[PDB]
Write a protein that binds this ligand. Structure first.
Ligand SMILES: Nc1ncnc2c1ncn2[C@@H]1O[C@H](COP(=O)(O)OP(=O)(O)OP(=O)(O)O)[C@@H](O)[C@H]1O
Ligand SMILES: Nc1ncnc2c1ncn2[C@@H]1O[C@H](COP(=O)(O)OP(=O)(O)OP(=O)(O)O)[C@@H](O)[C@H]1O
Lengths: 133, 133
């Protein structure tokens, strides 16, 4: 029953490390299921959930974009921000969601849109992942 | 004069690939000059210029943070955005700088200042690096 060593790193350092059966992530190209033996690969990740499977139990992590690196003996997710499901502050993410929506409807604006949309997506992603704890 | 392979990749894909005598970058910890034989290292990068020294000649790349991944033989810069100095659209970056400055100067409510400050740093860095083409 083979496993892959996975590490999730943010600019603050490692947030998660384990040996798991499968790592599923959303790359810019599509959903990827990384199993032991996967060829080496470096792919950009979208604001999405990473799903880490170990003996049927699945651990969810909100990844606010970053990069996936797959090597023979390791899988690394390098994320601009990452939170395990159980560590997401749901109130804060709801507040963030509503703030982005308010900006996006601003009209009276020096409001930046592209970044306001990304702010909304990071909040919705965190809320979706938190539902899984 | 030993070399290290350098790769710079962004969510659009590779920006640069070559063998250089040294790569210098601004990590969260401070400036790093990476020579061949450097031990493994993952470090987050600041909004900065990467200086790639080759045959006396130096190539500059504007890097909008992301991560540095070092092995004795090869250095990967995984950037949220990166532009070789000669590829920087100066008119664009100046407009971004002035747009961010207008946003920052606004005493109006939820403009979102943190990411306005980051937008300004990115434009200033690009304008500075373009000068090094
Ligand atoms: N609601 C959440 N629960 C736990 N930590 C979070 C949450 N939202 C952001 N963080 C953390 O705060 C730091 C900044 O993250 P980021 O810049 O993506 O926040 P943001 O989308 O601007 O949200 P906010 O406006 O709520 O601060 C990162 O360390 C991140 O892991
Ligand atoms: N002035 C520049 N010249 C060439 N490409 C650039 C420049 N500014 C951003 N880009 C490119 O556009 C894409 C988005 O980059 P980024 O999100 O950092 O832009 P930005 O800071 O929002 O700037 P702008 O407001 O001008 O779009 C990245 O591919 C990047 O390489």
């Amino acid at each position: 029953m083979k496993t892959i060593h996975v590490s999730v790193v943010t600019p603050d350092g490692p947030v998660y490390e384990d040996d798991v059966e499968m790592v599923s992530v959303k790359a810019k190209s599509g959903e990827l299921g990384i199993l032991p033996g996967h060829i080496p690969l470096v792919a950009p990740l979208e604001i999405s959930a990473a799903r880490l499977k170990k003996g049927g139990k699945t651990q969810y992590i909100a990844v606010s974009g970053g990069f996936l690196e797959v090597r023979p003996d390791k899988v690394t997710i390098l994320a601009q921000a990452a939170e395990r499901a159980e560590d997401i502050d749901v109130l804060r993410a709801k507040a963030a969601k509503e703030r982005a929506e308010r900006r996006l409807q601003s009209q009276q604006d020096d409001i930046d849109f592209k970044r306001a949309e990304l702010a909304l997506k990071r909040a919705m992603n965190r809320l979706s992942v938190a539902e899984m704890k």
